[PDB]
Amino acid sequence: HMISHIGTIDVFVNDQDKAIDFYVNTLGFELREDQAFGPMRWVEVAPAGSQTRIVLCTKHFPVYEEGKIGRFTDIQLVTEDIKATHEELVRRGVNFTRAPEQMPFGGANASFQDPDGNEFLLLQPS
Amino acid sequence: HMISHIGTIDVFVNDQDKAIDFYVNTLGFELREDQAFGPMRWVEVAPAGSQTRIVLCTKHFPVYEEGKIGRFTDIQLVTEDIKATHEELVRRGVNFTRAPEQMPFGGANASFQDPDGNEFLLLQP
């Protein structure tokens, strides 16, 4: 179809190397891209086998604005086992702003942050 | 793997009927969810066959904050033929803030807005 899919969503970070370490080694994402360009570096990470990728943006990126590092990202990540994933991420040092919580809405959600305070929703669907 | 994929991204709109009409009818997205839960309506739209969905949210959602309606969404949408897509969307009344142009480091992109001024990048990789 005309528009096939959502390719990427931007997440803004203070340090791409530190963020790559977080997203890949602690969250378990794949490092999808890491290519120099201007001074700029294009960094993409994504859950293994997933279609849409997160672009880890610094400033220099024309897409950035002040306030974009360390906000609620409005992104909802999906897990098949929120209990296990919560426990494992906490073990690796991840800050959960809200622990797993059963929903009326069926399934269960939680909220966590990356090291810059970028906040994600974590969902096990019904 | 603990996290399987990005399920959803929020986009904030003034009127969900109108936004449905734009995303579903004008952009060609599938209406994935449309459920009333009291005074709030859960609406999801996504490109056909695509994994991640857009949740069409309002002012009255707990995830809302002042200024979230009508901004650059930080979303790149993918097309295999940006010339064709651009021209078709223009025929359908879509306002492009930037026409397609070759990127310095490969590919081509453009940017357009929904009726509330939410802005998307459109990319032919």
Question: Which residue ranges make up each domain of chain A?
Answer: 1-126
H or E segment at B34? Answer: strand B30-37
Token digits of residue B90:
């223009």
Instruction: Tell me if B74 and A63 make a contact (CB, 8 A cut-off).
Output: yes
* B27: Cα within 13 Å, side-chain hemisphere: 30
Nearest residue on chain B to A82, alpha-carbon basis: B2
Please say whether the beta carbons of A84 and A75 come within 8 A.
no
Are residues B52 and A48, on separate chains, in Cβ contact within 8 Å?
A: no
Sign of the CA dihedral running B75, B81, B87, B89: negative
Q: Is A4 on the interface with B (CB under 8 A)?
A: yes
Give the one of B6, B27, B72 whose C-beta lies nearest to A3's C-beta: B27
Q: Which residue of A has its CA nearest to B36?
A: A105
8 A C-beta contact, residue B86 and residue B101 = no
Number of other residues whose CB lies within 10 A of the CB of residue B69: 17
* Nearest CB to B3; choose among A9, A28, A55: A28
**HSE-CB for A22 with a 13 A CA cutoff:** 23
Q: Which two tokens stand for residue B125?
A: 């990789």
Task: Kindly determine whether residue B78 and residue A27, on different chains, have CB atoms separated by under 8 Å.
Answer: no
**Solved with:** X-ray
Q: Write down the residue that tokens 């790149």 correspond to.
A: B76
Q: What backbone torsions phi and psi does residue A14 show, to the nearest 5 degrees?
A: -80, -35
Q: Which residues contact A96 (CB under 8 A, 6 or more apart)?
A: A86, A89, A90, A110, A111, A112, A113
Of A3, A4, A50, the CB nearest to B4: A50
Report the CATH architecture of B1-125.
Roll (3.10)
Nearest-neighbour CA in chain A from B46: distance (Å): 8
- Placement of tokens 């033929």 in the chain: B81
Answer yes or no: CATH 3.40.50.620 is held by domain A1-126.
no
8 A C-beta contact, residue A2 and residue B28: yes
